[PDB]
């Protein structure tokens, strides 16, 4: 559990531009690429915005439908991907609502109960061999779906 | 131990900076970035705030490890054109390095002058992102031994 002190938008913008200007294709030779437990990545991301959500009077639900799911990736870029989805979810979330975060065997879903920064999500995902699906949820609200090939 | 890194707002707070450094250093090199001309969020940076803020990130943790951090400000209203996150990384690397090779009970000196700042420890007499970020900002970095013993890093610029 390493600590890094800062906001997110400014860190995101810089990293996005550095990724674009490097014209990087694969993760193979990136510093610190490892097998990331997505369970811990998602939980760690929830912990980071927990207090922010509390003061915005928003709850964060973490549903773990699968366990032991591991993907090859750069933990910092992946954390940045998740953090942008959570920040977006919290931002457009009315008091008393729940931001829904679900870990499935081949995807994770970030869902809010509301009515760019999402372009880096797509860029980091593609880099990680992940697809990103945006759209409206069944029970209403905005829904981001990051998916990969099931192991 | 864990590959994961907490993003907010002794070894654990050096590790965070270490991981961000490694990634951004690599990305800087691969992008072969020449100037600040097209970088996002390039602005006039007040160096007092940057140094004080960096000291603030470190102070309490270093205190618990019996290391005192002294910030001296000889000049004020000093502004440089730069990218804030990169300058924050530069300063923090020099700081983490100075706290790391500092023996217990010693003092780390951070000094801001008109055309330079100095980070100085009392330790013995890897981090070349400092050189890279500095060069990008039109700054020079000089390493060496302190006038009274210990390590010294000086970041200088013109005007």
CATH number for the region B10-157 comes to 3.30.565.10
Helix, strand, coil content of chain A in percent (nearest 5): 40, 25, 35
User: Chain A partners of B33 at a C-beta cutoff of 8 Å?
Assistant: 18, 21
Specify the pairing of strand A70-73 against strand A2-3.
Answer: unpaired
Q: What are the angstrom distances between the C-alpha of A151 and each of A73, A107, A111, A148?
A: 15, 11, 24, 9
Helix (H) / strand (E) element for B30: namely: helix B11-30
How was it solved? X-ray
User: Chain B partners of A1 at a C-beta cutoff of 8 Å?
Assistant: 1-2, 4-6, 12
Q: Are B54 and B91 in contact (CB under 8 A)?
A: yes
Q: Name the resolution in angstroms.
A: 2.5
Give domain limits for chain B: 10-157
User: Chain A partners of B17 at a C-beta cutoff of 8 Å?
Assistant: 4
How far, in Å, CA of B131 to CA of B138, rounded? 10
How far, in Å, CA of B16 to CA of B14, rounded? 6
Sequential DSSP letters for B115-138: SEEEEE-SS-----HHHHHHHHTT
Q: Which of B96, B100, B139 is nearest to A5 (CA)?
A: B96
How far, in Å, CA of A10 to CA of A44, rounded? 20
**Secondary structure class of B113 (helix, strand, coil):** coil
Q: Which of A56, A39, A66 is nearest to A112 (CA)?
A: A56
- Domain A7-148 part of CATH 3.30.565.10: yes
How far, in Å, CA of B134 to CA of B141, rounded? 7
- Residue A55 touches partner B, C-beta closer than 8 Å: no
End-to-end Cα distance, chain B: 45
How far, in Å, CA of B48 to CA of B50, rounded? 6
Q: What are the residues facing B61 on neighbouring strands?
A: none
Q: Which of A77, A64, A82 is nearest to A34 (CA)?
A: A77
Asked if A2's CB is within 8 angstroms of B12's CB, the reply is yes
Specify the pairing of strand A2-3 against strand B5-6.
Answer: parallel
How far, in Å, CA of B55 to CA of B113, rounded? 16
How far, in Å, CA of A116 to CA of A72, rounded? 26
CA distance A13 to chain B (A): 7
The alpha helices in chain A, defined as continuous H runs, are 8-22, 38-55, 75-91, 118-127
End-to-end Cα distance, chain A: 26
């Amino acid at each position: 559990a390493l600590l890094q002190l800062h906001g997110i938008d400014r860190a995101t913008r810089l990293v996005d531009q550095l990724l674009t200007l490097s014209r990087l294709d694969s993760l193979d030779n990136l510093q610190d690429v490892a097998e990331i437990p997505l369970e811990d990545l998602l939980q760690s991301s929830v912990m980071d915005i927990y207090h922010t959500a509390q003061q915005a009077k928003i709850d964060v639900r973490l549903t773990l439908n699968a366990h032991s799911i591991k993907r090859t990736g750069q933990p910092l870029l992946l954390s940045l991907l998740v953090r942008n989805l959570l920040d977006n979810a919290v931002r457009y979330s009315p008091q008393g609502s729940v931001v829904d975060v679900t870990l499935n065997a081949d995807n994770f879903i970030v869902r809010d109960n509301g009515p760019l920064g999402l372009s880096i999500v797509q860029r980091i995902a593609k880099l990680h061999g992940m697809n990103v699906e945006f759209g409206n949820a069944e029970q209403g609200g905005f829904e981001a779906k990051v998916s990969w090939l099931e192991h």
